[PDB]
Amino acid sequence: VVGGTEAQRNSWPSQISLQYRSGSSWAHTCGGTLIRQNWVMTAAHCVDRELTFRVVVGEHNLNQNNGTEQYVGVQKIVVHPYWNTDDVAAGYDIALLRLAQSVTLNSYVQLGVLPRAGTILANNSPCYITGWGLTRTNGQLAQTLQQAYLPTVDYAICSSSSYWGSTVKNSMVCAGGDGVRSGCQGDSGGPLHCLVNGQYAVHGVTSFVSRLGCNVTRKPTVFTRVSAYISWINNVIASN
């Protein structure tokens, strides 16, 4: 997250760190949202590589013991069947991860609530992106979980020629684009939390930013629209 602030450690208890095994250690690669005690929602593109993945819930500082973490292996990966890794603009950038164990819930570890199917946010709706992704274009990962306030940009504006044009689909949510605050590499797969009727819900799964940089004016961060995939999510969980 470029232009973020450090999150309080109990603000976003559904945020997870998706990590892969790297030598004798683990490396953060993406975010995710805990949606059942044994299921995480992330971006399909985060699990394109043939790696050993784990999830960390209750994580705050990637580089220090928080005293709250639970580390769990990924047992099964179910990518959306229409996902195509060389065409992120087509959409379908979503995957579910079944965890090897069911995590224990507490103030640091909670299920993300999802919007009702079909819900579309009005333009300029209040949301936060969260994650440990780069804090500058071509920068480095954050140590501590970051948040940035990113107002939605509705489809009509986001798919206009000076924004994303044809590349944004109605199956996506756009947020931000102010040239200061954005998602960045390593935030993919994590949540966009939007405040609706007094309650935050996870309306987005971070999918992409501009090839020209993270915080680029009129290139808002683009997220898979969770509310387009409710039936898919429920179907996967019910059949696994």
The residues carrying an active-site annotation are 45, 93, 188
Q: Does residue 50 have a known ligand-binding role?
A: no
At its nearest, how many Å lie between Na ion and the CB of residue 104? 16
- Judged by CB, which is closer to Na ion: 37, or 144? 144
11 is a site residue for Na ion (CB under 5 A): no
SS (H, E, C) the chain: CECCEECCCCCCCCEEEEEEEECCEEEEEEEEEEEECCEEEECHHHHCCCCCEEEEECCCECCCCCCCCEEEEEEEEEECCCCCCCCHHHCCCCEEEEECCCCCCECCECCCCCCCCCCCCCCCCCEEEEECCECCCCCCECCECEEEECCEECHHHHCCCCCCHHHCCCCEEEECCCCCCECCCCCCCCEEEEEECCEEEEEEEEEECECCECCECCECEEEEEHHHCHHHHHHHHHCC
Decide if residue 171 touches Na ion (CB under 5 A).
Answer: no
Least spacing, CB of residue 60 vs Na ion, in Å:
6
The response to whether 110 counts as a known ligand-binding position is no
Region 51-80 residues binding Na ion, contact defined as CB under 5 A:
61, 66
**What minimum distance in Å lies between the beta carbon of 28 and Na ion?**
10
The answer to the question of residue 143 lying near Na ion (CB under 5 A) is no
Binding residues for Ca(2+): 59, 61, 64, 69
Provide the annotated binding site: 59, 61, 64, 69
Binding interface with Na ion (CB under 5 A): 61, 66
